[PDB]
Design a protein around this ligand. Structure first.
Ligand code: ADP
Ligand code: ADP
Ligand code: ADP
Ligand code: ADP
Ligand code: ADP
Ligand code: FAI
Ligand code: FAI
Ligand code: FAI
Ligand code: FAI
Ligand code: FAI
Ligand code: CL
Ligand code: CL
Ligand code: CL
Ligand code: CL
Ligand code: CL
Lengths: 355, 355, 355, 355, 355
């Protein structure tokens, strides 16, 4: 429901000499907050007892807003403190979850960097797939039912698994059932897709509304448990084990793509951005991620996407190979975001970047 | 054919107050170009429609020379524009390929950073092997024919494969034949070598003719498709698949060697450089790479080498652990190259570094 | 035996205007030395013929103390040169080994950064396990004998191996016996523990006595041979091989943890530090490492620890994502150590950091 | 005559990927050019034999356009080279003079940073005085004729002189006549004004059209010959001399104002800018200078002004006390100008800053 | 009256995770505030309508506390806002004046950087002279009455004047009387001292309680009106004028002393600091200034001193020749102060630096 005009009129009651930057103490905040500081902003970190330390030892947050549980960040109490601090909020991962995405779309009355509406088109696999499909991006083939399985597939609902046949599907579905990890409910709605075999590049872009431009900021590959520990076990020993792959994100590892694939990489960000404009105006605002896999035909296949800032950006908080190129600075995505805010304020174009 | 005296006399007609740096928009250019800019140079990027974007959004090239296809970079038209811009060319990967290595050795009349002649000793496995062998470097054992196969071997001609027996060789050779990936022609000339099992360090060195010194700039490990995606599949599931490993370079990942192996690492660069002096004078000039594997006996075995700048340097465009040590700067290899140029110009020693 | 008062009285005869920083040319020294230089210190590198080059080409050491073999660093001759240079020694890895840990605890009369006593609690698996256990840290389950083996286990004594049964244990123990890699002596004392399956984070902390605070400096994952080369071989091909995993450290790869796990990460450093205070006063001083594995339940399990600086810090000599956050500098662990020294000298608190 | 639309249509035929920055090798160019380089621009310096060295040894210009005499910079030949290089021209001091201000206002068909029209309102004392007067700025009292002289006055036409009476006026007018320094022509048009006695602050501002804001960049005091050498002679000795003060600008000396006078300083820039908008639209664009004198009542009296960049900015090419405050950078005025250009290009607002 | 224990107990109720730095928008604040920001602090500027602009355009203050008149900064309302923001106050010049020094010594209940008590020993010429005299510093000779005048003297009470005889004294005293500038009241209390003829060095020191050390930060020479404008008038013309010298501080100019005089310069800071310890414990804390004159015998004579930060530090907000030497940074005095605060907080030694 949340209107833009409704948000622009909250921002107007804002002391424009004292715009702070706020976000939740988790996910990507360290460099969101550090990046604000580096751009001259004072930073507000929503945190809680037990989860505050890293924001305290990294000296990255000027003001803390402590909650009892991160769940409370939907409360009017917290929204008020945030408005009283003239904070623009930088959403992420974790913020959407603890706040709840409905609360974010119509209950969270705090100005927010980026296109609010577009946060749903990422929460929903149908919307996400629509966008990537309509944008004209390579996605893994979808499979309506386990009977369609005609190659290796991955099956999504931690409870992930791999299958090369309909038979293998239920064999495994059953396994994860008789072990409590999967309920017949999840198994019914199971999303089955082509298992793309290749190299992982989670590619972090920044669309600048001010500059009307898609920028490449960086790239990481996921570091997942247990899978990445599983495959570090020799095949002989893996076969002697009764173990299921899990794919819990635990970290990220820096990587750079082959330079001749940047034209492809940029086109992918352009296309996505150009279609998101039509489907969810104003479209992709600020940071977004294409989580892709490079098959052996040097084709990047997008198996997931983020419409906010993605966790992999943590791999370059001190800047990386790509973010450096612009101005030879240790530029993080957090800071890149802070700059857009800064510059928008300075050109009186805050309406191009908040919602 | 291209003479040095012939090149020095092209460079003389050059406005020495306006030396630019040129290269082709691909492979390693981003930091070749950015590194020039950082050293005060104005940069020329040879590019083409559709492949130009990343050099435009990274603001890394002052002048573009657009071609219809990168193939045209052999044309006299392009050579002239380059000479008229007082450009020293920085070769790479991609440049050799689109230009063609014959054209580079006797048809490309533009001054070029590094030892021109030595670019062949990298194109040819016989020369390369000679050099590494004569330099005194550990290389994987070669195998004349599939009958000699007495361990695990890798077989080179994308169409790579692994074999642990003569039988397995043809079994697989056939596989890649009946699937169009390999023609009996490639299979006949198949290069078979010891499969070295260990950790990948692509080690980037810089020989400075001015300083007469081998420098360590950085290290990456290859990120290859589909192999690195293949091995991320659990053994159980891999066995249920009918899939062949491919080894297409798609990216690079930063790594540092165990410090006690740097003496070995430096000796390897010294030896290579000292033998390349005798075999292909003036020898290794500027950037070169030993693509090695560290076996469990902490011995680095070189399975490949580059005599120009290697793609892995992209892993440290914002500088890395090793390039930092010299002056605490975010030093890339591109910039290290620009500096040599700069300094050579300033000491009037351009003849120690171009050809 | 070495007393603190005994060490403080060596340091007093020191020219406090000329404190140098010394360490051994290996392990982590490059950034220990570079970090000293960056903090204004003059640096002393103990080296030897053939192992000196990298410290010479990296221009990181002001004075070399050449030995015939690194073994000699216990000699009174070397201790004297070091005292005459007013050097505080920064221990590491390699230093403990060549010097010998007994020699370090009671024969090495040179001031040393960090808690001397605590270097043993890392050399001994019983002490180490006590500390991690008492600190309240997750460790892999221990197994008294091969008969207790009831899951996958790893077995430690290069000569490492994996087992999923008592039968498999001896099958493999025998293998490594009949191949000379393992003697019945090692096999008897074999340490058997739960094979933790997950993502490797070697987490580098710095306890500051001055600031009384645990800082997070960085993280790497080990790059080991042959294992990490072994698992890069396709399962089908691995099965056709007769090859044993080895786990020789050859390098390190940068990684960042999922941000929501930093509270856990910091608590682990706090707990360790708080227990080391009681067990080995003054406790953990300066750099220490928890070498952990993140299981799929996002629990970090510590399978090893260093009480001095760990080799992985080499992954961020030009600084990393975490070290950056403090002051936006390319901060290495070597430099972080130099700073503590510097600052201790300046506040006249050298007794909080040497021993 | 020169139209804006006329200029915007020259700029359109410009390759927007290759905008260079050009100016004349003199006056303030060193930091105009260096500041461009630092912002990523390639720089064009118009120079001539004998006057080129400092731009060559400072490595500040990528391309030189040599003229026979700086006078030629009006020629169509030079305008074409400049248009072909996609150069935006940055006017100064010296450029106006050698080019001639008429040629600049209607004959110089090269895009130019800042408000073209406003360059006249600085060439003419009547316009200048109007502006400062209408802006509401303190100026020294004007004196119609030598008979009005009722205090100390300075008299302007090198040929300057000071008078405290009508009698003294002609006494001195005669002196400079019978010595050839002044012709009866100059003496007739002599401008006579109140001699303001106080401290010199030449205050360099930057109006940003993008940010719609007046910024304080720096301050210098003039270093003039012979006056500043004259007054360094003891009074006793000066009286024994027959010497006339001259006021030839030879250099500049850095100074900072008393902080409590910055509100006054900023108001002066605001007022000037706000009136220049009405009188000469778009008004003051970019760099301008109020050359003032602080009387003992802490009132700043403007005795001169520049509507382009003023020579004093040379006092802070490595940045100064005020330019630092914004981002802690060594920010020069040249660079501040380059940034505006850069940013205007990036927001597609080149029409707010060229003419 | 204000107690330390009384202040330490205000600071305890402070959120130690959110210490801000506050001061008054004037005098030296720009670099006090900027220096805080650079050290990670969030900054509070007390300002008022009309005087706020420079702190707004320099983006140097995160939070403004607007007053109706700077006088109000004594109000409990303002003290509360400041305590609620966890602000340590950095006194200066302007702050003492608007707040009133009595209010500062016993009515201003906000923690304050430096030794509170010592602010009086600077307000009073008797205390100041005692300190400089007892410290063992060269001061100009004092003159009890105009009859003692036996050389050139300067006479202090804007209303300053110079005299070389008793006769000249009253001649001039009368002049400034019959012109309203001096009342018989001021003339009675007139302070008469030796006119020291030499070069002005206002020398800015920083005593660090943490480091127990006097540091040299920088040096400026005063730029005063009308005197410095007066002496720029030729002697002949000055004699034709009826003008009185005034000495209103309007600005500052950077200068460096002859290096061989630094031993003297440092001794002067040591002595002052060592005597201030005895006379006003804890003594000189943080920034202080010796405003001296170098006579021709290379002896520095202190004619004034500041016990807080002096306005001349504005001459090096981007750092200067001396502040650079420590760490090669553009270190201002504001930042040097912020660092002491930072570091004191980090070593839990806030009691060594506040009062
Ligand atoms: N189509 C696919 N082919 C191969 N691996 C995949 C595919 N989709 C996902 N994965 C692996 O499983 C992990 C979880 O996938 P997914 O849940 O889609 O990403 P996320 O949970 O981060 O949105 C991915 O990081 C990737 O490594
Ligand atoms: N002797 C070998 N042992 C194991 N792996 C190898 C060997 N040679 C090559 N490889 C793997 O195959 C990839 C392709 O090898 P190669 O074609 O020699 O390198 P490039 O194509 O980059 O010159 C390498 O990056 C390496 O990972
Ligand atoms: N409990 C475990 N589970 C899985 N892998 C392990 C375990 N312990 C060690 N390893 C692997 O074997 C390597 C050697 O382990 P260890 O010898 O304990 O470390 P280090 O030799 O560096 O002290 C580790 O780097 C890790 O990759
Ligand atoms: N009204 C004045 N009172 C005192 N000095 C002045 C006055 N006007 C000019 N001067 C001095 O003479 C010099 C030349 O003045 P002017 O010619 O107006 O400046 P410019 O030539 O730089 O435009 C100035 O730099 C200043 O030092
Ligand atoms: N003893 C002296 N000899 C010569 N000049 C002096 C002397 N004392 C002060 N002055 C000049 O007069 C100015 C005002 O002096 P004073 O009022 O003592 O300093 P402040 O007002 O800054 O405390 C000084 O900046 C200096 O230039
Ligand atoms: N790559 C990362 O480091 C990363 N960390 C967290 N996420 C995502 O962030 C969301 C919330 O993060 P968390 O559980 O740490 O609060 C999760 O749905 C997870 O998919 C990540 N992935 C993408 O944002
Ligand atoms: N490591 C890398 O990122 C990398 N990228 C490209 N190359 C080599 O560069 C040559 C040309 O590169 P490309 O196909 O991107 O134009 C290829 O033969 C490839 O082996 C690479 N390897 C070595 O130069
Ligand atoms: N991770 C690393 O790069 C690393 N390099 C060396 N070490 C340890 O350092 C010790 C001595 O090192 P070296 O063998 O290079 O002299 C060894 O016991 C080894 O376990 C390492 N691991 C931990 O310190
Ligand atoms: N302050 C300076 O260094 C300075 N240098 C040159 N100017 C002005 O510049 C004009 C041209 O300079 P020049 O003679 O160096 O080419 C002159 O009218 C002179 O008044 C200066 N003053 C203002 O622009
Ligand atoms: N040197 C300077 O720039 C300077 N500016 C101001 N002061 C002193 O500061 C006090 C208050 O300053 P103000 O009048 O700008 O608010 C005055 O007594 C003046 O002597 C200065 N001198 C010493 O602090
Ligand atoms: Cl992102
Ligand atoms: Cl290379
Ligand atoms: Cl460590
Ligand atoms: Cl200006
Ligand atoms: Cl001071």
């Amino acid at each position: 429901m949340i209107s833009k005009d409704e948000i622009l009129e909250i921002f107007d009651k804002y002391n424009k000499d004292e715009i702070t930057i706020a976000t939740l103490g988790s996910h990507t905040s360290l460099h969101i907050l550090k990046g604000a500081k580096l751009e001259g902003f004072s930073t507000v970190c929503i945190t809680m007892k037990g989860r505050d330390v890293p924001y305290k030892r990294f000296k990255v947050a000027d003001k803390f807003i402590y909650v009892d549980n991160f769940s409370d960040i939907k409360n009017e109490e917290i929204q008020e403190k945030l408005r009283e601090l003239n904070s623009i909020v930088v959403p992420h991962g974790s913020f959407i979850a603890y706040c709840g995405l409905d609360n974010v779309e119509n209950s969270f009355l705090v100005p927010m960097f980026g296109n609010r509406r577009i946060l749903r088109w990422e929460s929903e696999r149908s919307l996400e797939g629509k966008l990537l499909r309509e944008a004209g991006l390579r996605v893994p083939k979808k499979y309506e039912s386990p009977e369609d399985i005609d190659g290796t597939v991955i099956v999504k609902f931690r409870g992930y698994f791999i299958a090369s046949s309909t038979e293998e599907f239920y064999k495994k579905a059953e396994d994860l059932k008789k072990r409590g990890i999967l309920t017949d409910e999840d198994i019914a709605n199971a999303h089955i897709e082509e298992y793309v075999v290749g190299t992982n590049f989670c590619i972090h872009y920044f669309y600048s509304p001010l500059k009307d431009e898609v920028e490449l900021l960086g790239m990481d590959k996921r570091y997942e448990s247990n899978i990445d520990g599983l495959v570090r076990i020799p095949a002989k020993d893996q076969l002697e084990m009764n173990i299921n792959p899990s794919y819990v994100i635990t970290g990220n590892i820096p990587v750079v793509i082959r330079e001749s694939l940047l034209p492809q990489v940029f086109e992918m960000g352009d296309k996505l951005v150009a279609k998101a404009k039509e489907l969810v105006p104003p479209g992709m605002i600020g940071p977004f991620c294409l989580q892709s896999l490079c098959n052996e035909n040097l084709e990047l296949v997008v198996f997931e996407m983020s419409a906010r800032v993605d966790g992999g950006t943590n791999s370059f908080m001190n800047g990386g190979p790509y973010s450096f190129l612009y101005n030879g600075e240790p530029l993080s995505m957090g800071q890149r975001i802070a700059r857009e805010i800064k510059m928008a304020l300075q050109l009186d174009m805050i309406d191009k970047i908040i919602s």
